[PDB]
Ligand binder design. Structure first.
Ligand SMILES: CC(C)=CCOC(=O)/C=C/c1ccc(O)c(O)c1
Ligand SMILES: CC(C)=CCOC(=O)/C=C/c1ccc(O)c(O)c1
Ligand SMILES: [Ca+2]
Ligand SMILES: [Ca+2]
Ligand SMILES: [Ca+2]
Ligand SMILES: [Ca+2]
Lengths: 116, 113, 116, 113
């Protein structure tokens, strides 16, 4: 897929499984419109969010529901969610892997961008 | 201050200076109301954003303009900005630290008494 | 494999390719003995370092040569290398994925540990 | 001090207090010679490790006993310790920050004038 998200748990040393996330795309009127959503698999990965045809140029936001994840494990975390906002496909189609590493009071996010 | 933000540059090994950010508070209609902003000092820190009386429980967002920072250094960045969204809950001081790279950022909260 | 290492470049948003690393295992006399070595592929991954039979209980150190990596890209980085030291297989065989995220003055490392 | 270390806890959102560490300098025979050590304060910081005259160019290693820290909190950790190995090169102050999780750590250097 042109967009994949991978989430890891830094407390348990495991993929972060069943983590919900919503993707939005910024509309011409500057509002965030729903684009795609899903949950991470047993591998901590979410594939198949979109297609090369649908994933046009624009500004996208991935909101990862990290708070529900920690809560279900008995932990009250700091962040409401982890947010990743980026311009996609500005110079033609790319594949994007967004990786998030989660701790209760901290998170890291990185992007790997490759040319098809 | 009950809220301080510190920003570091992982490419140059330095404070991230003159980084602009806005702080928003979530309203009843679920929109973001601006309520504080500033830019980081030479030590990469932004102090004096709010007071104890003003900083009531609620959901807050700190939006750090990382894109402009990297653009001024001539480096193309991935993120439009870095956002930190959190609930403040009731003596507490919040220090939000953000470590910046062109294609990655990390943020941590140090919450003390 | 029971041991895999993945290295990413946070400046370029890409896998870190051709990154050398050496693995050592602590000997009975407390010295580090060479165990395995290799370089990351185009995917930023290094597979096939060892086998389940060879990868016995012990304390292992992965030394990732991050300095040579940055130097070849024209950057003088802070760290000599990134080091990952851990006890492996203490409770029976596990699979270990060590992920390192590199910037010139910072690095992060995480482990994903799974039960075969 | 020309060298300061700061350690933070990503699970509890706090300074990592009473974390022991040793600093070594690389010798001509390629062995590590101990030369400073201490444990972090209530602010998670360790100051006074060395002086400008003593802190000459060379390769240094800071070995942070993260395992003992997590063990005292009843949490099983992955790493034996966190090591930061770097060359000091010639006015410079080094601040080494380490952010700790049970299965992950990050370290950054802030090098200033
Ligand atoms: C599959 C791919 C291209 C990236 C996924 O990499 C990982 O499994 C973990 C990446 C990572 C993300 C954040 C970190 O702080 C860190 O040390 C590593
Ligand atoms: C006092 C000074 C110059 C930096 C102190 O650093 C912090 O308060 C937080 C640093 C930090 C924040 C996130 C990280 O992943 C990391 O490795 C370090
Ligand atoms: Ca895919
Ligand atoms: Ca365009
Ligand atoms: Ca493999
Ligand atoms: Ca055993």
């Amino acid at each position: 897929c042109p967009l994949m998200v991978k989430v890891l748990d830094a407390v348990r040393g495991s993929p972060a499984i069943n983590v919900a996330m919503h993707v939005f795309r910024k509309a011409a009127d500057d509002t965030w419109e729903p684009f795609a959503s899903g949950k991470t698999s047993e591998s901590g990965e979410l594939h198949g969010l979109t297609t090369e045809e649908e994933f046009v140029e624009g500004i996208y936001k991935v909101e990862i529901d990290t708070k529900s994840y920690w809560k279900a494990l008995g932990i009250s975390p700091f962040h409401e969610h982890a947010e990743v906002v980026f311009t996609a496909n500005d110079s033609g189609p790319r594949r994007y892997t967004i990786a998030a590493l989660l701790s209760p009071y901290s998170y890291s996010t990185t992007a790997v961008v490759t040319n098809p």
